[PDB]
Each structure stands twice: as C-alpha cells, then as structure tokens.
C-alpha cells in the first residue's frame, strides 16, 4: 500500500486534445463585428459607446497565456488553466470582458445603473 495519499489517477488520450493552434493579432474588426461583440457581452452600443470601445478591444483580445481550450471525453469543448490546474465551461477572456463592462458601467453610472 501507499502508506499515505494515493496517485492512482485516471488517464485517456481523448482528454489530451488541445484546440489552441492559430491566432491573428494585427487584423482590424468591422463596425458590424464590434457591434456583434457589444450586443453579445450585454451592451446597448447605440447609447453606451464607452462600453463599445471596450467591445472593440474585446473581439481582438486572446486568452491569458495560462488558459487554452481542450476536448472533454464526453464529446464536448471546455477551457483549462495549465498553471493553476483549473477548468472553465465558458471562455476566460469573454467572462472577464462581461465583468469588465459591468464594472465600467457601474463606475460611469456612479452606482446608479439601470
């Protein structure tokens, strides 16, 4: 026996399929694509153009250097942090941009947001 903590962890090859491969940094998004990320992250860009400067940077921004997508053995896609050893079911940068929009909106509205 191990006479302490056991290391008999499960293994699979389907759990090794990482989806991070290509990304472009220099491309410029169209106004229709900036409006699409603004509407997707919860913004009304017709009345909230500050939160849409946030969305312009939003659509071009990549994931942090420790986080990347991978395949789960049930046949599904998820996100994993390789420095902390943590999983997520939504994009870490997308969840960050929603939180950043909400906090910027609360500051611009001086806690009187609607």
UniProtKB/Swiss-Prot annotation:
According to the UniProt entry, which disease involves this protein?
Nephronophthisis 15: An autosomal recessive disorder characterized by the association of nephronophthisis with Leber congenital amaurosis and retinal degeneration, often resulting in blindness during childhood. Additional features include seizures, cerebellar vermis hypoplasia, facial dysmorphism, bronchiectasis and liver failure. Nephronophthisis is a chronic tubulo-interstitial nephritis that progresses to end-stage renal failure.
List localization entries. Answer: Cytoplasm, Cytoskeleton, Microtubule organizing center, Centrosome, Centriole; Nucleus
Domain annotation WW: ranges: 61-94
* Task of the protein: Plays a role in microtubule organization and/or maintenance for the formation of primary cilia (PC), a microtubule-based structure that protrudes from the surface of epithelial cells. Plays a critical role in G2/M checkpoint and nuclear divisions. A key player in the DNA damage-activated ATR/ATM signaling cascade since it is required for the proper phosphorylation of H2AX, RPA, CHEK2 and CHEK1. Plays a critical role in chromosome segregation, acting as a mediator required for the maintenance of genomic stability through modulation of MDC1, RPA and CHEK1.
What tissue specificity does the UniProt entry give? Expressed in several cell lines.
Name of encoding gene: CEP164
Task: Quote the protein name from its UniProt record.
Answer: Centrosomal protein of 164 kDa
Instruction: Quote the PTM field.
Output: Also MDC1-mediated chromatin remodeling is critical for DNA damage-induced phosphorylation.
Which species is the source of this protein? Answer: Homo sapiens
The UniProt subunit note reads as follows:
Interacts (via N-terminus) with ATRIP. Interacts with ATM, ATR and MDC1. Interacts with XPA (via N-terminus) upon UV irradiation. Interacts with CEP83, CCDC92, TTBK2, DVL3, NPHP3 and weakly with NPHP4. Interacts with DZIP1.
